[PDB]
Amino acid sequence: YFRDNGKHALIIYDDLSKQAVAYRQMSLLLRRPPGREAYPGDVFYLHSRLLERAAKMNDAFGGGSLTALPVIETQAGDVSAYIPTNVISITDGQIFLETELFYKGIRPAINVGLSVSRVGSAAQTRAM
Amino acid sequence: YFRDNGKHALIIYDDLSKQAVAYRQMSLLLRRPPGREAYPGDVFYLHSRLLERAAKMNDAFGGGSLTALPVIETQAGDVSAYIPTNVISITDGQIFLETELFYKGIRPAINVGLSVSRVGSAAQTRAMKQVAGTMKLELAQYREVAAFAQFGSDLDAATQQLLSRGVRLTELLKQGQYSPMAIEEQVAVIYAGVRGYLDKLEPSKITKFENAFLSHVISQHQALLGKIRTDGKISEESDAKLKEIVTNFLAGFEA
Amino acid sequence: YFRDNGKHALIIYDDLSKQAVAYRQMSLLLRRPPGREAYPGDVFYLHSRLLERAAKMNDAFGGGSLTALPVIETQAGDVSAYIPTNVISITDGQIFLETELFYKGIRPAINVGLSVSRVGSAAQTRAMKQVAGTMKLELAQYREVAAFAQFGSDLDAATQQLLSRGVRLTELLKQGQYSPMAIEEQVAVIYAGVRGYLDKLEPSKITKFENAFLSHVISQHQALLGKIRTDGKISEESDAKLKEIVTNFLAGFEA
Amino acid sequence: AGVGKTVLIMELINNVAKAHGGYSVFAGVGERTREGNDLYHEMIESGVINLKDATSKVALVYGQMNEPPGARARVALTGLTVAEYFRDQEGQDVLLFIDNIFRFTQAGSEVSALLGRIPSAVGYQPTLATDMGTMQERITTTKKGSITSVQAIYVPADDLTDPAPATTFAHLDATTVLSRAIAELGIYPAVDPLDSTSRIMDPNIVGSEHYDVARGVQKILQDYKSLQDIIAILGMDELSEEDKLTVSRARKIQRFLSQPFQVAEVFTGHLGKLVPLKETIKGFQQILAGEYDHLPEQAFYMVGPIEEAVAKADKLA
Amino acid sequence: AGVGKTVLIMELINNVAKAHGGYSVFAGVGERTREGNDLYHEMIESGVINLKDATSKVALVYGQMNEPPGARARVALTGLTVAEYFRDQEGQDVLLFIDNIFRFTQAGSEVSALLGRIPSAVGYQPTLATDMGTMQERITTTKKGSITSVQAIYVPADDLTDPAPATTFAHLDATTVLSRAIAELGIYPAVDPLDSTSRIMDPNIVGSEHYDVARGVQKILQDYKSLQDIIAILGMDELSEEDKLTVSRARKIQRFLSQPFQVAEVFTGHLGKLVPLKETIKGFQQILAGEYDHLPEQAFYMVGPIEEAVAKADKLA
Amino acid sequence: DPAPATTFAHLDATTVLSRAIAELGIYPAVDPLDSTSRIMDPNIVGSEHYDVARGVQKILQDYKSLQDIIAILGMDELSEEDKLTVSRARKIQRFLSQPFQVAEVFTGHLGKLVPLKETIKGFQQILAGEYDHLPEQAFYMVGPIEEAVAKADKLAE
Amino acid sequence: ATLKDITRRLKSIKNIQKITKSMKMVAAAKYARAERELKPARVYLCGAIHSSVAKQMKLANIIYYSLKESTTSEQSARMTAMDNASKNASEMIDKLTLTFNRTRQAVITKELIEIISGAAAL
Numbered sequence A: 001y002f003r004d005n006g007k008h009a010l011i012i013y014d015d016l017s018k019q020a021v022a023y024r025q026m027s028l029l030l031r032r033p034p035g036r037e038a039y040p041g042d043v044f045y046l047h048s049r050l051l052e053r054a055a056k057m058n059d060a061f062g063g064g065s066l067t068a069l070p071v072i073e074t075q076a077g078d079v080s081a082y083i084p085t086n087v088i089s090i091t092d093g094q095i096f097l098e099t100e101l102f103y104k105g106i107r108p109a110i111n112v113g114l115s116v117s118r119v120g121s122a123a124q125t126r127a128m
Numbered sequence B, C: 001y002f003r004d005n006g007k008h009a010l011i012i013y014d015d016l017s018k019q020a021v022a023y024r025q026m027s028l029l030l031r032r033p034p035g036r037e038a039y040p041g042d043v044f045y046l047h048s049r050l051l052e053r054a055a056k057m058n059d060a061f062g063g064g065s066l067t068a069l070p071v072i073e074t075q076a077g078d079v080s081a082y083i084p085t086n087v088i089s090i091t092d093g094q095i096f097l098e099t100e101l102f103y104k105g106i107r108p109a110i111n112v113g114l115s116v117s118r119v120g121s122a123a124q125t126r127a128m129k130q131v132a133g134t135m136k137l138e139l140a141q142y143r144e145v146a147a148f149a150q151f152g153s154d155l156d157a158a159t160q161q162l163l164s165r166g167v168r169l170t171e172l173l174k175q176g177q178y179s180p181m182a183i184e185e186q187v188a189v190i191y192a193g194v195r196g197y198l199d200k201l202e203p204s205k206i207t208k209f210e211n212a213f214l215s216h217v218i219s220q221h222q223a224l225l226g227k228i229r230t231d232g233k234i235s236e237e238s239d240a241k242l243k244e245i246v247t248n249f250l251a252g253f254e255a
Numbered sequence D, E: 001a002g003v004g005k006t007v008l009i010m011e012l013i014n015n016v017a018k019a020h021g022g023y024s025v026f027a028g029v030g031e032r033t034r035e036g037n038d039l040y041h042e043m044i045e046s047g048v049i050n051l052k053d054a055t056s057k058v059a060l061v062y063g064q065m066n067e068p069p070g071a072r073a074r075v076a077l078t079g080l081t082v083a084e085y086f087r088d089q090e091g092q093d094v095l096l097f098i099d100n101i102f103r104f105t106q107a108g109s110e111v112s113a114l115l116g117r118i119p120s121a122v123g124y125q126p127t128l129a130t131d132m133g134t135m136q137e138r139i140t141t142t143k144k145g146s147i148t149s150v151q152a153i154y155v156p157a158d159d160l161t162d163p164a165p166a167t168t169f170a171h172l173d174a175t176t177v178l179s180r181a182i183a184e185l186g187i188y189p190a191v192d193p194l195d196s197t198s199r200i201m202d203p204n205i206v207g208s209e210h211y212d213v214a215r216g217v218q219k220i221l222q223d224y225k226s227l228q229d230i231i232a233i234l235g236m237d238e239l240s241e242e243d244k245l246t247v248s249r250a251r252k253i254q255r256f257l258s259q260p261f262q263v264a265e266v267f268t269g270h271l272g273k274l275v276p277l278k279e280t281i282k283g284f285q286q287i288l289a290g291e292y293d294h295l296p297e298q299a300f301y302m303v304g305p306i307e308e309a310v311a312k313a314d315k316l317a
Numbered sequence F: 001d002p003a004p005a006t007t008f009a010h011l012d013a014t015t016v017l018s019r020a021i022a023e024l025g026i027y028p029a030v031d032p033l034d035s036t037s038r039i040m041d042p043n044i045v046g047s048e049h050y051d052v053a054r055g056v057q058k059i060l061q062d063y064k065s066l067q068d069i070i071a072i073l074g075m076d077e078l079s080e081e082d083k084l085t086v087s088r089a090r091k092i093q094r095f096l097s098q099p100f101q102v103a104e105v106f107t108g109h110l111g112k113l114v115p116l117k118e119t120i121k122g123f124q125q126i127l128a129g130e131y132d133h134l135p136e137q138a139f140y141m142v143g144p145i146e147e148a149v150a151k152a153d154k155l156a157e
Numbered sequence G: 001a002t003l004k005d006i007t008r009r010l011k012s013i014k015n016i017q018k019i020t021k022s023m024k025m026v027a028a029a030k031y032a033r034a035e036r037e038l039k040p041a042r043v044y045l046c047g048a049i050h051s052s053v054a055k056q057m058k059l060a061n062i063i064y065y066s067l068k069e070s071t072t073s074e075q076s077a078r079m080t081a082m083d084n085a086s087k088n089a090s091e092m093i094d095k096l097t098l099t100f101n102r103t104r105q106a107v108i109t110k111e112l113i114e115i116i117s118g119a120a121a122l
Ligand SMILES: Nc1ncnc2c1ncn2[C@@H]1O[C@H](COP(=O)(O)OP(=O)(O)NP(=O)(O)O)[C@@H](O)[C@H]1O
Pocket: B088, B089, B090, B116, B117, B118, D001, D002, D003, D004, D005, D006, D007, D008, D154, D188, D189, D190, D261, D264, D267, D268
């Protein structure tokens, strides 16, 4: 609503892990054959469809926008995991937090090396 | 039947490992969803239902009882597997035998730190309380300094001494098969090591001291044994009497 | 058709991995039951019935043969995955190739320690055996010590010797593509390092040495190679002639 | 299995339930019958259960290891309901102990195939989360009443990534993750210090003194943790003088975290201890601060207050 | 391969005919056609098989690798059937050879999968343990006679806890480990004296004497193993009047453990020896004892009874 | 994974990227030991091209093998012969990175396009010991070898 | 854990164990030489060597002494140290292999269960 009316919105999906489980449950109970890891063969699609909606419209469409900050829970800090990578391959970057860094005193536990922003400095003020 | 009639039975399930695979064969053939290790979701219940039946009734129900010693076979000493864990979460303690121990010549290959008896201290005789009580304690203090490290030069008289009981105490726990001992016989020999009467001796003689000192008090002193056993405790005289008995036997022991 | 008619035939299956996939695809679409990796219970039988048709006939049948070189693609070197396990289990030996070797400069990437030939020498020529045999052995010996090299801050000259034979023999096994050699050329070169002639040569040069050395004897000495060839072995004579040919060529070589 | 869940519930029942003004509800779900019996009679003995007067402060509900799946699948709901009455119908401050809530989920997995459902991961029922959810969501404090609930969560094959335990983290405010590795070192309770958490570990709630010792202890244990790989092949020799001091302190902090429980006296061979918070904040400060770098590790093992750790050191001479 | 597997299988055959008048069967479960035909002619050339007369001491049963699952599945039973006859009909002591026990199990899984049954852990059959038990159990000593089985084992992934292998050891009473390393010592049979094992090596079963000698032979062989490292590096001499004796004897022992097979006479140009148990224990008893410390190593290489160790010494001046 | 796995056969050249390399800040994150081309043939690119490439791969492989070991046992015991390949490898590892013209928003560096001969030569020299004096960092995020030399000075302080 | 991860460590701890083992045989060697040469001189990653002196730290006739001694002690020290390092590497190669095979097995069962699960829902 805000995005299409030249206004600006920010949405946090906390978290997309529990939704996938919900989807998986709803889906299995409909008797749709389980797929990789027990999830529907379309869990990628489940999240792509959603997150593609966060977007920047041109002035021709109001110049409004929608920014999304989806959350995903890894296990044993394993980011290579199927769901984790499914979602990392949809968004425009990731902020990876490690418990090692956290305990070590590094809070936020942002892992410099593994986090990225596919927008780069184009999303930064010149000062920054 | 025995439990239910004021009587006392002992059941040995050997092994629950293989029963579990038999039940799983049944479950996969019936087509029930295979889960962890392909085991059906209810294998924990296959076991809880069974082992809940061992039990100690009270007087109003006969005072009878059923004791279960179920056996579980681990692979590569992995006690975290699905089945082993299941069963540990049902019984009231475990007796883990280690392959290392077994070859190294410690048999029964019991792992005294890992093994436990959650409910048995009460069931324990005072006589043993008396000797076995300061045995894990000594053995606690030996568990530490007893490293994997085969060639270690040590220091400190105390820690040295601790290391010295430990090797004797450990010889005292070695036992052959088919030769179960009378509680009063066990407190006797344990008394010998836990009181120090074997400190001045060499680990290789402990076995030999045991048979020799045991036959001796079995032949000659059925009189003290019977008190120990009958009293069920170690009275001042019995203990006093025992002390001299280890004393003299020692004094005549041929190396 | 060749095998049966007293003729010899060679067959390369490239790869049996892809055909297994083709078969799995039909099996599952026809809805037959899927086993490990989704492969049908008869995938083992698909290859065994194929790889057994290769064989050496008896004169009574023509003495003709069918040799088969089947290719299997492993994943992350998982020689125990399903299809790689079947086919390894069916064939008479395996030539194991490795990326680490490849990128380290060993091309062809044959892992000599794990590769095998159940048939063995029953198939080597006497010429080759005359050399193959000690090479096989110093290599196995190097393989025992190899790891030490890079930290050999002070190894005895006994083992320091095997490291040297080790790296030279290894450099002799290297080979460019599209240039297969005549058994007589291979033994002449192998003889060179195996006998010790390249031991004082620089590892970095063996590739250059062989190349030129072999160019030389293929040019100038086609009568010795013809001997080796014919006599099928290295006569005491040709042995002596090679000694001079290499000791003079080497001298030439480090001028 | 066998790491300390029940012993910890018992010690808490002792240390908290015993002097609680208000009621308590113990719900035994899928556990041992002997335990129900051990507890009942113990409760009688300390008088929390009185068979003479109406002064009992505990209601007991049980559906143990011997019941068919459906019973184990519902007793939690039953203990739960009892507790809800005191909360809302009497605005009471309740205490709710459950051993073990993992059994409810397991029970669910037992009947699920029979209900004819395609299984989800690890053979569990596709309705695992919602089943935990509509149940876990009634175990809660509200404006009408308070429910402090302590739930033991059995972790199958020791795998915390198991759907059951994995799905339970999100419902707690504080978690005490027990470890076989620690237990095997002889540290009891076998709590993993870098894996347990609490939404109260906020400076604005426990005070910064507390918040800084807490994060202090974790940081040094985290640091020790990374050195461990190398310590493992080569020992300490090659370690830096500085690194060896973290190691000393970490091993002394690790030992000082252990403690004798009344409930585990028969096994520790020592008298149970109850340490007051300020005594804990303190004892840990000093350790951190290098005020005991002279004492031996063993001095810190199995003690209450730091003052006892100094003493033990003298006795060790 | 390379380690004398087929010559050892053939001496056992012969020695069973000789010392027990028992015959043997050979079941090749999933045999490579090439390798059977090669086994055939090799028994023939060594006589165990006789095409001319009626002195064959082996019946061969084959389940080649091209055969469908069901065939490679049953051929070990067929071989079993044959052997049971020489026991239940003629009360001999038959020998059963299943080569190799792993392909039996695999054939089982293929058949299982084809019958559409859900595989169990690691993809094997749900009935892995029963498929094995219904066969293994027919191999025993009944009142009429006994079948003894030598089973060639293939361990998948070098994983001894893999379901195939693990199941199999449930039935084994001993292992005969052929070793390429031992072979390299020239020692043959190339059996490993420290890795090979047996359930019946119990004084309560083999008798103290037997049991002590055996345990004497191994320790010495073990001790020498220790020293082996020293010798090569620091050189063979800080060696004690004692350390130099353990070696000497050990090296004599290692050799005394080798032996000439009658199966390899057509080839070794040497006479085969079938040493008796009594002769065996005495032999080693004395070396341990120190009775032949003066004798030289090579006196013991490839001989039968100790008496031959003595005589060889004579011819070796 | 069945998909990536099934696609290799359809290619004549493959550039395999790795998060382990990327994680170090080395972009493009190509894995030098898992990337291949059907034209990496002396008969097609020439022996200078070919000997350099393989020369670079041997040293990176040689260093990969040592990595896990100097990790624990440290570096002192290593032969000067072997601590030079650790050197050269670490510099090559860097000289392989490059600031892309489409990632200035990412690297904060002007994009460089290097010509085939500037590449072959740059590596040839590192392999030849001709820069064992410059610091590794001088080789990180630069185009042609001359920028590595210039960057050394700029870093010289 | 990933079979590929576990195979890296294993791959490397297997090496570290052989290196370490080799370094002791060397350390024993030099230490042989040293105990002999030591004899006469008194009538006149190395363990905790360099540090022991380092902490407590804050001619010729005796120079050759402290030297001829400080090398027996050192080659002694490296020896035992590398003796236990491979003793440690071995407990690990045996420990990791078990983790490797538990995982290896687990990965295969997990997949099949996935297939079977999907087939059965048709
Ligand atoms: N705090 C403790 N101090 C000392 N020993 C303890 C402690 N907690 C547990 N133990 C020992 O560990 C055993 C198992 O304890 P328990 O608390 O019953 O484990 P658990 O997690 O409930 N086991 P289970 O329900 O079978 O999964 C006890 O009997 C003691 O022997």
